Amino acid sequence: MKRTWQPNRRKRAKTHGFRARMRTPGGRKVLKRRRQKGRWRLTPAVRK
Amino acid sequence: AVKKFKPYTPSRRFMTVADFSEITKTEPEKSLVKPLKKTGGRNNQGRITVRFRGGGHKRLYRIIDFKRWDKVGIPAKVAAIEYDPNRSARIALLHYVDGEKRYIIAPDGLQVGQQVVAGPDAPIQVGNALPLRFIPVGTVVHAVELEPKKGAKLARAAGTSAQIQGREGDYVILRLPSGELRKVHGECYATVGAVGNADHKNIVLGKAGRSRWLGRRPHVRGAAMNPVDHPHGGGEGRAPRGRPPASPWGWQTKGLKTRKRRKPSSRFIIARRKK
RNA sequence: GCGGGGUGGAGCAGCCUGGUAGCUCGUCGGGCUCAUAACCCGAAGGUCGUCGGUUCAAAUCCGGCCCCCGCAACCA
RNA sequence: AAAUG
RNA sequence: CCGAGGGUAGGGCCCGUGACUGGGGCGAAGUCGUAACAAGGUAGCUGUACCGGAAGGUGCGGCUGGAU
RNA sequence: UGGGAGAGGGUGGUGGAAUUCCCGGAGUAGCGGUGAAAUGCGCAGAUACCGGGAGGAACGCCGAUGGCGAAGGCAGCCACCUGGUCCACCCGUGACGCUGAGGCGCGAAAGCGUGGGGAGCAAACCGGAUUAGAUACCCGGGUAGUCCACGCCCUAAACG
RNA sequence: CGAUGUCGGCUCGUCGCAUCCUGGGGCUGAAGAAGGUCCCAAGGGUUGGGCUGUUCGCCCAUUAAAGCGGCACGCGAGCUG
RNA sequence: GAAUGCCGGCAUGAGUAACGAUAAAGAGGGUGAGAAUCCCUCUCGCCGUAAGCCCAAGGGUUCCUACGCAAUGGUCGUCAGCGUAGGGUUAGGCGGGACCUAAGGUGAAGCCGAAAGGCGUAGCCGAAGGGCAGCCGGUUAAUAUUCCGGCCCUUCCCGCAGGUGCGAUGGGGGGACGCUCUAGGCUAGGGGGACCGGAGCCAUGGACGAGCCCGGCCAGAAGCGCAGGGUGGGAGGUAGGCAAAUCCGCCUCCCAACAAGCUCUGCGUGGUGGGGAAGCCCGGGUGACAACCCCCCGAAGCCAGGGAGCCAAGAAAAGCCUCUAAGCACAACCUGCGGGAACCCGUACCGCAAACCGACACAGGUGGGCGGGUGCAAGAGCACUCAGGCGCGCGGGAGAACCCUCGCCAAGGAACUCUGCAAGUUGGCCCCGUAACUUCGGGAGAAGGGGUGCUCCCUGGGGUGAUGAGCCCCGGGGAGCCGCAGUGAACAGGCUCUGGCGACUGUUUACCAAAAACACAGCUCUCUGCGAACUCGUAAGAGGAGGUAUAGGGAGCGACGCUUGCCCGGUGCCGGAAGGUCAAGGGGAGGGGUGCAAGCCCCGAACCGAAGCCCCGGUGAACGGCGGCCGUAACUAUAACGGUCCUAAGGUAGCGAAAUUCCUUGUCGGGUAAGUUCCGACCUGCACGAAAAGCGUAACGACCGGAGCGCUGUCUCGGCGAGGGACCCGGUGAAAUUGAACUGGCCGUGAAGAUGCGGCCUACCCGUGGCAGGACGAAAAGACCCCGUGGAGCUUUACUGCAGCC
RNA sequence: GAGCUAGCCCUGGCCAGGGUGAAGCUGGGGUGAGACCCAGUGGAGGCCCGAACCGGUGGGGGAUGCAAACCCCUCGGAUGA
Ligand SMILES: [K+]
Ligand SMILES: [Mg+2]
Ligand SMILES: [Mg+2]
Ligand SMILES: [Mg+2]
Ligand SMILES: [Mg+2]
Ligand SMILES: [Mg+2]
Ligand SMILES: [Mg+2]
Ligand SMILES: [Mg+2]
Ligand SMILES: [Mg+2]
Ligand SMILES: [Mg+2]
Ligand SMILES: [Mg+2]
Ligand SMILES: [Mg+2]
Ligand SMILES: [Mg+2]
Ligand SMILES: [Mg+2]
Ligand SMILES: [Mg+2]
Ligand SMILES: [Mg+2]
Ligand SMILES: [Mg+2]
Ligand SMILES: [Mg+2]
Ligand SMILES: [Mg+2]
Ligand SMILES: [Mg+2]
Ligand SMILES: [Mg+2]
Ligand SMILES: [Mg+2]
Ligand SMILES: [Mg+2]
Ligand SMILES: [Mg+2]
Ligand SMILES: [Mg+2]
Ligand SMILES: [Mg+2]
Ligand SMILES: [Mg+2]
Ligand SMILES: [Mg+2]
Ligand SMILES: [Mg+2]
Ligand SMILES: [Mg+2]
Ligand SMILES: [Mg+2]
Ligand SMILES: [Mg+2]
Ligand SMILES: [Mg+2]
Ligand SMILES: [Mg+2]
Ligand SMILES: [Mg+2]
Ligand SMILES: [Mg+2]
Ligand SMILES: [Mg+2]
Ligand SMILES: [Mg+2]
Ligand SMILES: [Mg+2]
Ligand SMILES: [Mg+2]
Ligand SMILES: [Mg+2]
Ligand SMILES: [Mg+2]
Ligand SMILES: [Mg+2]
Ligand SMILES: [Mg+2]
Ligand SMILES: [Mg+2]
Ligand SMILES: [Mg+2]
Ligand SMILES: [Mg+2]
Ligand SMILES: [Mg+2]
Ligand SMILES: [Mg+2]
Ligand SMILES: [Mg+2]
Ligand SMILES: [Mg+2]
Ligand SMILES: [Mg+2]
Ligand SMILES: [Mg+2]
Ligand SMILES: [Mg+2]
Ligand SMILES: [Mg+2]
Ligand SMILES: [Mg+2]
Ligand SMILES: [Mg+2]
Ligand SMILES: [Mg+2]
Ligand SMILES: [Mg+2]
Ligand SMILES: [Mg+2]
Ligand SMILES: [Mg+2]
Ligand SMILES: [Mg+2]
Ligand SMILES: [Mg+2]
Ligand SMILES: [Mg+2]
Ligand SMILES: [Mg+2]
Ligand SMILES: [Mg+2]
Ligand SMILES: [Mg+2]
Ligand SMILES: [Mg+2]
Ligand SMILES: [Mg+2]
Ligand SMILES: [Mg+2]
Ligand SMILES: [Mg+2]
Ligand SMILES: [Mg+2]
Ligand SMILES: [Mg+2]
Ligand SMILES: [Mg+2]
Ligand SMILES: [Mg+2]
Ligand SMILES: [Mg+2]
Ligand SMILES: [Mg+2]
Ligand SMILES: [Mg+2]
Ligand SMILES: [Mg+2]
Ligand SMILES: [Mg+2]
Ligand SMILES: [Mg+2]
Ligand SMILES: [Mg+2]
Ligand SMILES: [Mg+2]
Ligand SMILES: [Mg+2]
Ligand SMILES: [Mg+2]
Ligand SMILES: [Mg+2]
Ligand SMILES: [Mg+2]
Ligand SMILES: [Mg+2]
Ligand SMILES: [Mg+2]
Ligand SMILES: [Mg+2]
Ligand SMILES: [Mg+2]
Ligand SMILES: [Mg+2]
Ligand SMILES: [Mg+2]
Ligand SMILES: [Mg+2]
Ligand SMILES: [Mg+2]
Ligand SMILES: [Mg+2]
Ligand SMILES: [Mg+2]
Ligand SMILES: [Mg+2]
Ligand SMILES: [Mg+2]
Ligand SMILES: [Mg+2]
Ligand SMILES: [Mg+2]
Ligand SMILES: [Mg+2]
Ligand SMILES: [Mg+2]
Ligand SMILES: [Mg+2]
Ligand SMILES: [Mg+2]
Ligand SMILES: [Mg+2]
Ligand SMILES: [Mg+2]
Ligand SMILES: [Mg+2]
Ligand SMILES: [Mg+2]
Ligand SMILES: [Mg+2]
Ligand SMILES: [Mg+2]
Ligand SMILES: [Mg+2]
Ligand SMILES: [Mg+2]
Ligand SMILES: [Mg+2]
Ligand SMILES: [Mg+2]
Ligand SMILES: [Mg+2]
Ligand SMILES: [Mg+2]
Ligand SMILES: [Mg+2]
Ligand SMILES: [Mg+2]
Ligand SMILES: [Mg+2]
Ligand SMILES: [Mg+2]
Ligand SMILES: [Mg+2]
Ligand SMILES: [Mg+2]
Ligand SMILES: [Mg+2]
Ligand SMILES: [Mg+2]
Ligand SMILES: [Mg+2]
Ligand SMILES: [Mg+2]
Ligand SMILES: [Mg+2]
Ligand SMILES: [Mg+2]
Ligand SMILES: [Mg+2]
Ligand SMILES: [Mg+2]
Ligand SMILES: [Mg+2]
Ligand SMILES: [Mg+2]
Ligand SMILES: [Mg+2]
Ligand SMILES: [Mg+2]
Ligand SMILES: [Mg+2]
Ligand SMILES: [Mg+2]
Ligand SMILES: [Mg+2]
Ligand SMILES: [Mg+2]
Ligand SMILES: [Mg+2]
Ligand SMILES: [Mg+2]
Ligand SMILES: [Mg+2]
Ligand SMILES: [Mg+2]
Ligand SMILES: [Mg+2]
Ligand SMILES: [Mg+2]
Ligand SMILES: [Mg+2]
Ligand SMILES: [Mg+2]
Ligand SMILES: [Mg+2]
Ligand SMILES: [Mg+2]
Ligand SMILES: [Mg+2]
Ligand SMILES: [Mg+2]
Ligand SMILES: [Mg+2]
Ligand SMILES: [Mg+2]
Ligand SMILES: [Mg+2]
Ligand SMILES: [Mg+2]
Ligand SMILES: [Mg+2]
Ligand SMILES: [Mg+2]
Ligand SMILES: [Mg+2]
Ligand SMILES: [Mg+2]
Ligand SMILES: [Mg+2]
Ligand SMILES: [Mg+2]
Ligand SMILES: [Mg+2]
Ligand SMILES: [Mg+2]
Ligand SMILES: [Mg+2]
Ligand SMILES: [Mg+2]
Ligand SMILES: [Mg+2]
Ligand SMILES: [Mg+2]
Ligand SMILES: [Mg+2]
Ligand SMILES: [Mg+2]
Ligand SMILES: [Mg+2]
Ligand SMILES: [Mg+2]
Ligand SMILES: [Mg+2]
Ligand SMILES: [Mg+2]
Ligand SMILES: [Mg+2]
Ligand SMILES: [Mg+2]
Ligand SMILES: [Mg+2]
Ligand SMILES: [Mg+2]
Ligand SMILES: [Mg+2]
Ligand SMILES: [Mg+2]
Ligand SMILES: [Mg+2]
Ligand SMILES: [Mg+2]
Ligand SMILES: [Mg+2]
Ligand SMILES: [Mg+2]
Ligand SMILES: [Mg+2]
Ligand SMILES: [Mg+2]
Ligand SMILES: [Mg+2]
Ligand SMILES: [Mg+2]
Ligand SMILES: [Mg+2]
Ligand SMILES: [Mg+2]
Ligand SMILES: [Mg+2]
Ligand SMILES: [Mg+2]
Ligand SMILES: [Mg+2]
Ligand SMILES: [Mg+2]
Ligand SMILES: [Mg+2]
Ligand SMILES: [Mg+2]
Ligand SMILES: [Mg+2]
Ligand SMILES: [Mg+2]
Ligand SMILES: [Mg+2]
Ligand SMILES: [Mg+2]
Ligand SMILES: [Mg+2]
Ligand SMILES: [Mg+2]
Ligand SMILES: [Mg+2]
Ligand SMILES: [Mg+2]
Ligand SMILES: [Mg+2]
Ligand SMILES: [Mg+2]
Ligand SMILES: [Mg+2]
Ligand SMILES: [Mg+2]
Ligand SMILES: [Mg+2]
Ligand SMILES: [Mg+2]
Ligand SMILES: [Mg+2]
Ligand SMILES: [Mg+2]
Ligand SMILES: [Mg+2]
Ligand SMILES: [Mg+2]
Ligand SMILES: [Mg+2]
Ligand SMILES: [Mg+2]
Ligand SMILES: [Mg+2]
Ligand SMILES: [Mg+2]
Ligand SMILES: [Mg+2]
Ligand SMILES: [Mg+2]
Ligand SMILES: [Mg+2]
Ligand SMILES: [Mg+2]
Ligand SMILES: [Mg+2]
Ligand SMILES: [Mg+2]
Ligand SMILES: [Mg+2]
Ligand SMILES: [Mg+2]
Ligand SMILES: [Mg+2]
Ligand SMILES: [Mg+2]
Ligand SMILES: [Mg+2]
Ligand SMILES: [Mg+2]
Ligand SMILES: [Mg+2]
């Protein structure tokens, strides 16, 4: 049947993307937190 | 004069339609339409705040002239009578000798080709707008302002009207469509006549789909829900109310009054409504 | 198993608070009527389901037994 | 108020 | 080919019969009341409507085939 | 041709008396009701009286043994639309008449449908009385209905 | 109770005998025939259908007869549900 | 040494199940160390509204070539979407940006919130909508509307000429709109041709033929032609379109009116440039100077912003045109021509799938366009088949039980079973014919029957065209022929009678419930006078609604028909300027502490003092409720009638052993040979009953009962056959589970059901196909039950708070 | 976290073919005029049959599956909520 993952680059960038993160106290905390952890990628990669 | 159908489907048995015999023009005035932004019953938070709304026919909004004291003394001609999907009344297209074009809601008896006028000097004739103080006592009137220059607020639905009952100081006394007796200010404008399309009340929707065309989504009873949802929810099998019948939010709904006590307009209401 | 009840012939009070049995109807006698009903006047009829106890004294309070209503008998 | 044979 | 008829299927009229049910008729005498005939003790009758153990009652309108 | 009398019919408009309700005033111990009462209403200010307002229905005197219509039936007043009918003149057509199975239309009240309206009245219903009882008569209430529009019903002691 | 799946049916049987039939008997209020009753006997046999989920039961048509019980009210790592 | 412990390693089950759709294979020849599996040819089968082709999303080099086969590939591998390396994606016109707006998002002004932040008109962002200029062929191993060739076109800049009051973010027009049905003319696509072009072919009994087989076009500027869309011209007045306006709107006059004209599309033609089969010979070359024509069918596509009808009444903004404003009229704009200028990103490849979403090369899921031919009434259905693509990445044998999917069956025909569950039957079209009942539509495809192929003869109407020939589409009549059988294959209703429930079409528990549940038109109560009520939010602000009582919210009931009784004592809600109670506050009789004292400080009675409650009323389609005992009639029975107690009032109509009836399989009747179900009655209704509606109701239902006809392997009662497995051989090779095991029967015993104890009995060692009685077999720390002063959802006149409201 | 799912908002797209034959309109009859009746035309509808598409009724299979909901036969809707 139709499964849960239906990839869509525009949706991915708008929902989880860097600029969505910086727009919001919680999203800026995600970025600060993944930096402090040393994540190589702060945000999901998506091609555009 | 509502029209019936023959029982060639189950739903056509009782479905009725308007006769549409007063309409003379079947597309709106382009300079006077603007998009109606459908809401779905959702507010600026995105929340349903009025349940069971959505999914009706698309509609353009026809701008309506609820002031009319905008163009005192400038007569106009009734150029057409048109369908308006945003209200029960029909609307009338006015061609002012000014060259300006406006819409008004169409009173009963208004004829395409006649002339209308607004102002203190206007004849007491169907379709004319005067301040309440210049209309003779006893006249049936419609599209009545509720405060000076704030716009017609009363009696705008198909077939409705208000009747002037008497006067007292700067205020005249009106019987509203609800049967309430209110004091309205004398400088408030109104329009001689009753709103047309009085047969509107006698329309039988006929089937479920018709409500859906009107943006009316299926309403579901509290009694059919669970206790998480509604005071009437639950019970094994069917169940009576088991308490004072209540809204989804708990407040009583058979008889419990709800107008604010200390509301300033109380001084100007003489008698709560009838029946 | 839990609650209520049994008192003239019928249906009900009195029991809770021990000493005093009461109301309507019916029954009997007499009136009125030609007569009957209705109506009026007077009367009789209950030892209180039963046995046992407490008490100076028990329809009344406490037990046993009989009888009649009502409720319950669920997870299984 | 006043039924019946 | 037609064709007595036989067969299959679906209809129409009539008759008989049927748990039960509806009122009707008849059979002197029981139970309940007293609706009508006198102004029958609320004049009656009436078409209709609602009601009631029963006759009946009441409403609206009609008739005199109503007394005084 | 010229005249006439009439609640004949339909539409719209309009007048005053009264009942009820509401607001103001003035006022106090009862009002109402019956055979007599009670229910009911009233010191939370009723009834009775004065002023104002809203609304519905019916039209007093004239009025009669009267008039009109085929019948049912029709009554304040005004205007419009319209039917029937009698009279005089003796002018016109020249039997063009009478009746009428069917058919069609009209048809008190009650009743029914969809709206509206709702003062008074009032089946049902409730209460107070009476009574052996009183699902009645009498009393206090009171919903349909009575009123309007449209559409049905088609009955009668629709009788002279 | 860190699981022993529970009524009835179907399928497959197997055992007990307090024996439904068939075999052998005694007593009889056993004339014959047909029964009654008790004794011996478990080798075999012990039908099809209507109703109900039913087991049971009633009923229809037959039969030599239309037995009663146990096997985790036999049998769901065999089926049904 | 144990914790269903943790991490790791390795065992067992086992050479076992499986190797992923039953569309299918065989042989020859190549390559190579090795070949069922790679390459080539021939034969066979499968898809063909796809299993072919083209877009979009997503994926991200998977594309092409060379060289490889350790691992990946369910086997193999010389092959590959795998490993290494090299190569490959070319645009002014296609898509997106340098254009526009939609929901939404953001947001100068402004508003709000302890902080964080929440709003908000304009503006800005935002597309698969609007707008906008490229068609055909060739070429590469791999890209092409991109390169090349031909023929076209757009914008910007500069210039030249001609023209004009030029000029805008401002005004205005336009852009600009639904659903259904649909005209005319075209095109796409297709069928046929006795005509045109073509390498050839004559087989096996016949044909050298008007034979067979193949093909008979594509793009195109101006002009022209055909078919359509769009659009009135002039003048005068002018107060409206937030300045102005010659524009637009409004008024009057004159001409014009299915037209015409002007303008814009489509189609045809068109200089020109392209393509071009079978067959044969090694992707190529020849065919070829290829031919390129006639008739018919014909869209849902085009002309298009066409037409008609209908109600539910159907985006915006820019491009564009017009109008003027500052300004400027050496400018500036319009038109024609010329030169120049024209940026950024995507472009490979898969794309119904082995490359996307499902952990897999996974029988699942994935939006748009094309989707040929014949026949079957039609069609995108069905069978076959073209182009094109495939035989599904383990095979070879065997021909047991058993399983799956399938075929047939003597006699019977539901006897099967909870149930005709399942499977038969029926089945398309044309004609004849069709009942109760009904809301007059329907019920209806009711039921039931007949016809159906092929040949010849005769003939009626229509389209194209010409009025004819031909072609094409509907039919009509007569005479015949063959078979068991003519919708000869494939696709395609079993029917009737009768109850229950729900009016109906709809909706639901994604993944055990599709229903009688939800919803539904309709009915009633109730709230709401507008800054409405109500809802969301601390607020601002929103929804309600740019709506206004014929409207909006809440609640119950649930088409329709005939109806919906009695109780207001309790609770609720509504009304009630009295009275009772009533907090803060006011008041301050009268007391107190302290100081020498003026004083400072405290307690404090009456009395005034909201809502709420008490109290008085109303109210049921408000919560709800609608009796008991005893007697009584021709000497039976029963009780119309009566007595008495209680209540706020004692269940009305209608219905009733019912989706409700305990006793119960009530009793009687019907149907059956037999009827716990069913249907019709009765009424002692354990425990119907009137909008948690009562009783009915045509039509409807994958709902739940009962019955009959038809027909059947459901059954008596089973038999045979088919294929895919199971079985054997070669390849690859799991799993839960497992204290260890050298693991028998009976009768006992034992923590009460023993392979493991006792006594007896039986028993050579080890496997393979099978069956499931046991190993209290496996799985899941029982979901029932209890326990825990464990948890959570839900309720209320439990307690205590809070929001909210007064 | 609404790339699954539920509702709504904006903007697009899709629904082979066949059947039934409402209103209206035209004509004819009818009548004082009417209603109304007949025929033709017309093309309505949460109408009918049936693909795509959307479903998920009954059964069988599957059950360490092809699949953590699938396959086959059958069946519901298919201009509309
Ligand atoms: K339980
Ligand atoms: Mg899904
Ligand atoms: Mg998605
Ligand atoms: Mg995207
Ligand atoms: Mg996208
Ligand atoms: Mg997105
Ligand atoms: Mg999205
Ligand atoms: Mg976001
Ligand atoms: Mg972002
Ligand atoms: Mg912050
Ligand atoms: Mg790094
Ligand atoms: Mg992140
Ligand atoms: Mg109708
Ligand atoms: Mg009709
Ligand atoms: Mg109209
Ligand atoms: Mg606009
Ligand atoms: Mg809005
Ligand atoms: Mg917003
Ligand atoms: Mg709401
Ligand atoms: Mg809503
Ligand atoms: Mg509205
Ligand atoms: Mg309107
Ligand atoms: Mg005012
Ligand atoms: Mg209405
Ligand atoms: Mg609408
Ligand atoms: Mg509902
Ligand atoms: Mg519920
Ligand atoms: Mg529920
Ligand atoms: Mg919730
Ligand atoms: Mg709660
Ligand atoms: Mg609750
Ligand atoms: Mg409840
Ligand atoms: Mg419930
Ligand atoms: Mg219940
Ligand atoms: Mg429930
Ligand atoms: Mg209750
Ligand atoms: Mg409540
Ligand atoms: Mg009011
Ligand atoms: Mg007493
Ligand atoms: Mg006492
Ligand atoms: Mg005493
Ligand atoms: Mg319990
Ligand atoms: Mg008297
Ligand atoms: Mg007597
Ligand atoms: Mg014969
Ligand atoms: Mg009498
Ligand atoms: Mg009398
Ligand atoms: Mg009397
Ligand atoms: Mg009475
Ligand atoms: Mg008093
Ligand atoms: Mg006083
Ligand atoms: Mg009034
Ligand atoms: Mg003469
Ligand atoms: Mg009448
Ligand atoms: Mg008395
Ligand atoms: Mg009524
Ligand atoms: Mg246990
Ligand atoms: Mg275990
Ligand atoms: Mg276990
Ligand atoms: Mg013998
Ligand atoms: Mg034996
Ligand atoms: Mg049985
Ligand atoms: Mg048992
Ligand atoms: Mg039994
Ligand atoms: Mg024998
Ligand atoms: Mg046994
Ligand atoms: Mg057991
Ligand atoms: Mg037992
Ligand atoms: Mg037992
Ligand atoms: Mg068992
Ligand atoms: Mg099982
Ligand atoms: Mg079992
Ligand atoms: Mg087991
Ligand atoms: Mg076992
Ligand atoms: Mg240890
Ligand atoms: Mg552990
Ligand atoms: Mg571990
Ligand atoms: Mg290691
Ligand atoms: Mg390990
Ligand atoms: Mg290992
Ligand atoms: Mg091994
Ligand atoms: Mg094994
Ligand atoms: Mg396996
Ligand atoms: Mg497998
Ligand atoms: Mg298959
Ligand atoms: Mg094979
Ligand atoms: Mg081979
Ligand atoms: Mg090699
Ligand atoms: Mg190989
Ligand atoms: Mg090899
Ligand atoms: Mg192979
Ligand atoms: Mg094809
Ligand atoms: Mg991938
Ligand atoms: Mg390898
Ligand atoms: Mg290898
Ligand atoms: Mg290597
Ligand atoms: Mg591998
Ligand atoms: Mg694999
Ligand atoms: Mg490449
Ligand atoms: Mg180019
Ligand atoms: Mg630029
Ligand atoms: Mg805050
Ligand atoms: Mg954006
Ligand atoms: Mg775009
Ligand atoms: Mg473009
Ligand atoms: Mg190259
Ligand atoms: Mg110019
Ligand atoms: Mg437009
Ligand atoms: Mg528009
Ligand atoms: Mg659009
Ligand atoms: Mg529409
Ligand atoms: Mg072309
Ligand atoms: Mg063709
Ligand atoms: Mg001007
Ligand atoms: Mg075009
Ligand atoms: Mg060639
Ligand atoms: Mg199309
Ligand atoms: Mg178009
Ligand atoms: Mg059009
Ligand atoms: Mg806009
Ligand atoms: Mg100059
Ligand atoms: Mg740039
Ligand atoms: Mg490319
Ligand atoms: Mg697929
Ligand atoms: Mg596709
Ligand atoms: Mg692929
Ligand atoms: Mg998976
Ligand atoms: Mg594969
Ligand atoms: Mg072809
Ligand atoms: Mg066909
Ligand atoms: Mg294969
Ligand atoms: Mg073998
Ligand atoms: Mg198969
Ligand atoms: Mg057979
Ligand atoms: Mg048979
Ligand atoms: Mg049969
Ligand atoms: Mg059967
Ligand atoms: Mg059955
Ligand atoms: Mg079943
Ligand atoms: Mg077939
Ligand atoms: Mg056939
Ligand atoms: Mg019949
Ligand atoms: Mg018929
Ligand atoms: Mg029938
Ligand atoms: Mg019927
Ligand atoms: Mg009919
Ligand atoms: Mg047939
Ligand atoms: Mg043949
Ligand atoms: Mg069919
Ligand atoms: Mg339902
Ligand atoms: Mg239903
Ligand atoms: Mg119904
Ligand atoms: Mg439907
Ligand atoms: Mg489910
Ligand atoms: Mg579930
Ligand atoms: Mg689930
Ligand atoms: Mg269903
Ligand atoms: Mg539901
Ligand atoms: Mg319904
Ligand atoms: Mg209704
Ligand atoms: Mg209503
Ligand atoms: Mg809130
Ligand atoms: Mg708004
Ligand atoms: Mg419902
Ligand atoms: Mg009926
Ligand atoms: Mg009450
Ligand atoms: Mg009350
Ligand atoms: Mg009260
Ligand atoms: Mg209660
Ligand atoms: Mg109560
Ligand atoms: Mg007696
Ligand atoms: Mg006797
Ligand atoms: Mg009644
Ligand atoms: Mg019964
Ligand atoms: Mg019943
Ligand atoms: Mg019951
Ligand atoms: Mg029973
Ligand atoms: Mg029972
Ligand atoms: Mg029985
Ligand atoms: Mg019988
Ligand atoms: Mg009985
Ligand atoms: Mg209720
Ligand atoms: Mg109920
Ligand atoms: Mg249904
Ligand atoms: Mg159903
Ligand atoms: Mg049957
Ligand atoms: Mg049968
Ligand atoms: Mg078989
Ligand atoms: Mg085989
Ligand atoms: Mg061997
Ligand atoms: Mg091997
Ligand atoms: Mg391997
Ligand atoms: Mg060991
Ligand atoms: Mg060992
Ligand atoms: Mg062993
Ligand atoms: Mg052994
Ligand atoms: Mg033991
Ligand atoms: Mg043992
Ligand atoms: Mg042993
Ligand atoms: Mg041992
Ligand atoms: Mg030992
Ligand atoms: Mg041993
Ligand atoms: Mg031993
Ligand atoms: Mg042994
Ligand atoms: Mg082996
Ligand atoms: Mg085996
Ligand atoms: Mg075993
Ligand atoms: Mg076992
Ligand atoms: Mg165990
Ligand atoms: Mg076991
Ligand atoms: Mg645990
Ligand atoms: Mg446990
Ligand atoms: Mg557990
Ligand atoms: Mg304990
Ligand atoms: Mg505790
Ligand atoms: Mg404890
Ligand atoms: Mg606890
Ligand atoms: Mg409130
Ligand atoms: Mg989603
Ligand atoms: Mg469709
Ligand atoms: Mg379409
Ligand atoms: Mg037909
Ligand atoms: Mg027709
Ligand atoms: Mg028309
Ligand atoms: Mg349909
Ligand atoms: Mg059909
Ligand atoms: Mg089946
Ligand atoms: Mg499963
Ligand atoms: Mg199928
Ligand atoms: Mg269908």
From Swiss-Prot, chain A:
InterPro entries: Ribosomal_bL34 (IPR000271), Ribosomal_bL34_CS (IPR020939). Keywords: Ribonucleoprotein, Ribosomal protein. It comes from the Bacteria. Residues 26-48 are annotated as: Disordered. Gene3D superfamilies: 1.10.287.3980. One of its GO terms (cellular component) is ribonucleoprotein complex. GO terms for biological process: translation. The keyword Glycoprotein does not apply. Residues 29-48 have a biased composition (Basic residues). GO terms for molecular function: structural constituent of ribosome. The keyword Lyase does not apply. Belongs to the bacterial ribosomal protein bL34 family. Found on the solvent side of the large subunit. This is Large ribosomal subunit protein bL34. It comes from Thermus thermophilus (strain ATCC 27634 / DSM 579 / HB8). The gene is rpmH.
Swiss-Prot record, chain B:
Residues 256-275 have a biased composition (Basic residues). One of its GO terms (biological process) is cytoplasmic translation. Residues 229-239 have a biased composition (Basic and acidic residues). One of its GO terms (molecular function) is transferase activity. GO terms for cellular component: large ribosomal subunit. SUPFAM superfamilies: Nucleic acid-binding proteins (SSF50249), Translation proteins SH3-like domain (SSF50104). Keywords: Ribonucleoprotein, Ribosomal protein, RNA-binding, rRNA-binding. Pfam families: Ribosomal_L2, Ribosomal_L2_C. One of the primary rRNA binding proteins. Required for association of the 30S and 50S subunits to form the 70S ribosome, for tRNA binding and peptide bond formation. It has been suggested to have peptidyltransferase activity; this is somewhat controversial. Makes several contacts with the 16S rRNA (forming bridge B7b) in the 70S ribosome. Part of the 50S ribosomal subunit. Forms a bridge to the 30S subunit in the 70S ribosome, contacting the 16S rRNA. May also make transient contacts with protein S6 during translation in the 70S ribosome. This is Large ribosomal subunit protein uL2. It comes from Thermus thermophilus (strain ATCC 27634 / DSM 579 / HB8).
